[PDB]
Design a protein around this motif. Structure first.
Motif, mmCIF file in Angstrom:
data_model
loop_
_atom_site.group_PDB
_atom_site.id
_atom_site.type_symbol
_atom_site.label_atom_id
_atom_site.label_comp_id
_atom_site.label_asym_id
_atom_site.label_seq_id
_atom_site.Cartn_x
_atom_site.Cartn_y
_atom_site.Cartn_z
ATOM 1 N N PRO A 36 0.831 -1.215 0.000
ATOM 2 C CA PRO A 36 0.000 0.000 0.000
ATOM 3 C C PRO A 36 0.866 1.266 0.000
ATOM 4 O O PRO A 36 2.067 1.217 -0.215
ATOM 5 C CB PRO A 36 -0.797 -0.138 1.296
ATOM 6 N N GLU A 37 0.217 2.404 0.213
ATOM 7 C CA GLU A 37 0.887 3.693 0.453
ATOM 8 C C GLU A 37 1.612 3.668 1.810
ATOM 9 O O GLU A 37 0.992 3.859 2.857
ATOM 10 C CB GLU A 37 -0.170 4.803 0.418
ATOM 11 N N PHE A 83 6.855 0.413 3.116
ATOM 12 C CA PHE A 83 8.265 0.644 3.345
ATOM 13 C C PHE A 83 8.732 1.876 2.589
ATOM 14 O O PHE A 83 8.689 1.890 1.367
ATOM 15 C CB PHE A 83 9.084 -0.561 3.027
ATOM 16 N N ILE A 84 9.229 2.903 3.252
ATOM 17 C CA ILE A 84 9.807 2.965 4.618
ATOM 18 C C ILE A 84 11.187 2.278 4.595
ATOM 19 O O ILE A 84 12.047 2.613 3.783
ATOM 20 C CB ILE A 84 8.863 2.602 5.822
ATOM 21 N N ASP A 85 11.399 1.341 5.504
ATOM 22 C CA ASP A 85 12.515 0.395 5.444
ATOM 23 C C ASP A 85 12.333 -0.405 4.158
ATOM 24 O O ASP A 85 11.491 -1.293 4.106
ATOM 25 C CB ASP A 85 12.462 -0.560 6.640
ATOM 26 N N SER A 86 13.160 -0.120 3.162
ATOM 27 C CA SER A 86 13.127 -0.854 1.879
ATOM 28 C C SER A 86 13.166 -2.375 2.073
ATOM 29 O O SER A 86 12.519 -3.133 1.351
ATOM 30 C CB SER A 86 14.270 -0.418 0.967
ATOM 31 N N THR A 130 22.874 -3.987 1.008
ATOM 32 C CA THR A 130 22.632 -3.450 -0.343
ATOM 33 C C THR A 130 21.859 -4.459 -1.205
ATOM 34 O O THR A 130 20.850 -4.119 -1.818
ATOM 35 C CB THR A 130 23.973 -3.148 -1.028
ATOM 36 N N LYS A 131 22.323 -5.704 -1.156
ATOM 37 C CA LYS A 131 21.962 -6.716 -2.159
ATOM 38 C C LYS A 131 21.165 -7.903 -1.620
ATOM 39 O O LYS A 131 21.056 -8.121 -0.414
ATOM 40 C CB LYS A 131 23.242 -7.251 -2.811
ATOM 41 N N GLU A 153 10.819 -14.464 -12.520
ATOM 42 C CA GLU A 153 10.494 -14.197 -13.932
ATOM 43 C C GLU A 153 9.247 -15.008 -14.311
ATOM 44 O O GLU A 153 8.191 -14.448 -14.578
ATOM 45 C CB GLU A 153 11.657 -14.580 -14.850
#
Lengths: 152, 48, 435, 48, 49, 49, 97
Positions: B5-6, B9-12, B35-36, B48
């Protein structure tokens, strides 16, 4: 849920034109069962008609004729259904055909795919559908294109 | 699209966990760091 | 001004002071809002005749340049090849662009390096990437604004009449702060010549225009000149200077730039003002006789400001982008076809990311020579105070400024100089039977 | 990769689309002592 | 609407001539700045001798 | 009839433009010629000093 | 060599462009008495290529792992062949003499 008097008359207004016979038949063919729903302003797949027909040989004219007394119940059935395909179900499908999300998809690419996938179209249904908006580049805008399909 | 939702995250990290959780995966077949993300055989090729 | 809906799609922070590209803080302007000014101008787009898409599209591309500064690389000293601690920072960039999200978050740190002609790979060391990402956002902005002006002139082209014109010169600069750099130099180097056109026009081109018209005038002049100092014609501007004839060799530094100025310009040419000892291990300052004030410029950093390098791949992958308006900002064509021989650019010419100062040679010839042939109208606006305060004036400042804008000599000629000027055929025909 | 049983053809196609996605140029190496089947495959690799 | 168009042509003719001049001078200045190089080149080669 | 005359005015515009563009190609080939001389300077400078 | 010239001249229709791939094709392990300038090339490559596996398959992935700062105890597999590619005392050695 039922079928209002406006719904009855619309079905009839077309049905009389559809049943093209010097003698009766007060009946259509299970193939006309399709295009009737279309003309009525409904949009089912052939597979939806095959979902509701007792003819595992689709398609062909000459097996079982249906009265309106059988059509109207089927119309009440179609009126219930949700799984028809929204703009959303199409906005999904389009998002691989743009090689870089713009809306502007290649006409030649659209041709190859429609013929191969889903229900499959005929040569004619391909050529007929792409007679605009073809510009000097060849960029069919998939979204406004879909909105037209929704429009009628 | 209904997964986030909107303001999920915030915290990705935290909102990736929401979307990936909605798609029924655990954070081990594909691993997270800072990062990864690390993918084993097929995992990315299954997304995919 | 943006609503809670657009806030999602557009990917703004709900909270403030999050945005990293906004230094210092949230500074205000005296008497305006930030909010209501949005609704006014957005309607100004509708009034321009923008499509309902393009409204959001131009904002999409513009807003990312706030988003990019958030990518916080962190030292992990095992090599110094840092990868940034997050994703949201660069995702709010990515989505607004519709560039391959995987291509973004990977390619930024590990791009395919053109080595001679072949291809190799490399991780960039921390600071290399940090600055190289900062390059990306400013790379979009230079391109977008250049795209914006060209796309805006489009709505306002003279739809098939006889293209007859006036030319108004609006170059906002000649600002004096401790920080003056190459940015201030390229701008103030036009303002210098405009002030020179004041000399060339108040004394000269005024009465040159009289000479052509053939009126009852008498030529008068005074020695107020700058030319033996500031290049006028494109070629002098396109020989100027060491940041022209040597801007491609690995040994040139901002140190040597000041030195080769000091050899060629100093001593014999009296107009040039030298630094007060920041030389040898220098910030590198110099000055020239500019009418309105002795500007202190700093030289260190001019190389990169006249090379402007970025990561290749990530922009090259932006070329393969979406959202139409996002994409167009990237390539060639530019309504012209010509070979690229480099030091630049495209035309002019081939590639080194930038060399904008050379691009500022081409257009410079095209503006100026035509500007000579156009009737001068002028307004010589003077500043009353430093303090940005309305109504207030200072004497020490104004004392100097009236002495500096050639106002004295300027009234000595322009006391008879006619400010009204029309057509004689009309005035003759319109007065007729008075007598 | 996770569509097809172990055969050379997919060893190719897997790497192909990966290159087309992640930009990484790539190089296959066959290994075996002296008596395996190396170049015997490579003729078929070229044809494929 | 044809007449409205045509009127731009007498003007664009004068427009082009001015540019034809300006980029001919730009060519001349560029040729000179090449000529200084070509002429000093004889000195450069002579000094190397 | 002025349609032909319209194009005739355009023909003066064709040549004025065709000339200029060719003078851009004049300066264009001179682009390789010019910078090649600037490079030829720098090496010869290093040969001398 | 005449063919190698001729064929790249005829089968290269797009000079200066990428991308590029490749396949490595070499023999294996064999031995012969008359060691002159030639034979040393083969077994040395089968060795170094085994090492090309070892380094890529065990080490390279970890060279980034160690840097990431993730809970990951390094895994040595004790397969090294570095000490034969160049001389320890003086670089090249034999070639220079």
């Amino acid at each position: 849920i039922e079928f209002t008097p406006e719904q009855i008359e619309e079905f009839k207004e077309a049905f009389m034109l559809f049943d093209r016979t010097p003698k009766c038949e007060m009946k259509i063919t299970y193939g006309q069962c399709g295009d009737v729903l279309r003309a009525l302003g409904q949009n089912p797949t052939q597979a939806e008609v095959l979902r509701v027909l007792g003819k595992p040989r689709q398609e062909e004219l000459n097996t079982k004729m249906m009265d309106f007394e059988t059509f109207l119940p089927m119309l009440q059935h179609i009126s219930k259904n949700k799984d028809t395909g929204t703009y959303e179900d199409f906005v999904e499908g389009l998002r691989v055909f743009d090689k870089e999300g713009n809306g502007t998809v290649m006409g030649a690419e659209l041709r190859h795919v429609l013929a191969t996938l889903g229900e499959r179209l005929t040569e004619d249904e391909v050529e007929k559908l792409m007679a605009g908006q073809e510009d000097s580049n060849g960029c069919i805008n998939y979204e406004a294109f879909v909105k037209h399909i929704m429009s009628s | 699209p209904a997964a986030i939702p909107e303001g999920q995250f915030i915290d990705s990290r935290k909102g990736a966990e929401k979307l990936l959780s909605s798609l029924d995966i655990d954070h081990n077949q594909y691993k997270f760091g800072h990062t990864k993300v690390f993918f084993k055989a097929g995992l990315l090729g299954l997304l995919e | 001004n943006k609503k809670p809906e657009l806030l999602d799609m557009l990917l703004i922070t709900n909270n403030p002071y999050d945005y990293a590209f906004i230094s210092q803080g949230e500074t205000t302007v005296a008497s305006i809002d930030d909010a209501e000014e949005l609704m006014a101008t957005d309607n100004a787009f509708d009034v321009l005749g923008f499509t309902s898409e393009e409204k959001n599209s131009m904002y999409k591309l513009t807003g990312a340049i706030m988003h990019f500064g958030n990518m916080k690389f962190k030292l992990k000293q095992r090599e110094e090849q840092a990868e940034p601690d997050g994703t949201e920072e660069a995702d709010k960039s990515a989505y607004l662009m519709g560039l391959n999200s995987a291509d973004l978050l990977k390619g930024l740190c590990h791009p395919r390096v053109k080595v001679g002609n072949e291809y190799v790979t490399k991780g960039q060391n921390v600071q290399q990437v940090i600055y190289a990402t900062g390059a990306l956002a400013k790379a979009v902005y230079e391109r977008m604004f250049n795209w914006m002006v060209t796309r805006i002139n489009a709505t306002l082209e003279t739809k098939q009449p006889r293209q007859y014109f006036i030319g108004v010169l609006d170059i906002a600069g000649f600002e004096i702060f401790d920080f003056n750099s190459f940015e201030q130099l390229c701008i103030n180097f036009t303002n210098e010549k405009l002030q020179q056109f004041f000399n060339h026009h108040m004394f000269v081109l005024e009465q040159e225009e009289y000479k052509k018209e053939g009126i009852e005038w008498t030529f008068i002049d005074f020695g107020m000149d700058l030319q033996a100092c500031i290049d006028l014609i494109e070629k002098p501007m396109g020989i100027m200077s060491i940041l022209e004839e040597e801007c491609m060799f690995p040994k040139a530094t901002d140190m040597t730039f000041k030195a080769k100025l000091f050899d060629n310009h100093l001593g014999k040419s009296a107009n040039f003002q030298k630094p007060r000892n920041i030389k040898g291990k220098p910030e590198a300052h110099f000055s020239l006789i500019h009418y309105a004030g002795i500007v202190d410029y700093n030289i260190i950093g001019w190389l990169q400001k006249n090379k402007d390098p970025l990561n290749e791949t990530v922009v090259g992958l932006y070329q393969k982008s979406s959202l139409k308006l996002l994409s167009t900002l990237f390539a060639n064509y530019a309504g012209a076809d010509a070979p690229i021989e480099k030091g630049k650019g495209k035309a002019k010419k081939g590639s080194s990311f930038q060399t904008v100062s050379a691009l500022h040679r081409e257009n410079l010839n095209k503006l100026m020579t035509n500007l000579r042939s156009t009737h001068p109208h002028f307004v010589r606006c003077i500043i009353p105070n430093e303090t940005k305060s309305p109504g207030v004036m200072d004497n020490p400042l104004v004392m100097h400024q009236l002495r500096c804008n050639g106002v004295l000599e300027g009234i000595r000629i322009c006391r008879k100089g006619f400010p009204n000027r029309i057509l004689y055929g009309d005035f003759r025909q319109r007065y007729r039977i008075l007598n | 990769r996770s569509e097809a049983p172990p055969h050379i053809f997919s060893i190719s196609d897997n790497a192909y689309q990966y290159m087309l996605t992640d930009r990484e140029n790539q190089s296959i190496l066959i290994t075996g002592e002296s008596g395996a089947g190396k170049t015997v495959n490579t003729k078929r690799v070229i044809q494929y | 609407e044809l007449e409205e168009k045509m009127v731009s042509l007498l003007q664009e003719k004068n427009d082009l001539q001015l540019q034809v001049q300006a980029e001919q001078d730009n060519l001349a200045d560029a040729e000179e700045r090449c000529d200084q190089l070509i002429k000093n080149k004889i000195q450069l080669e002579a000094k190397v001798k």
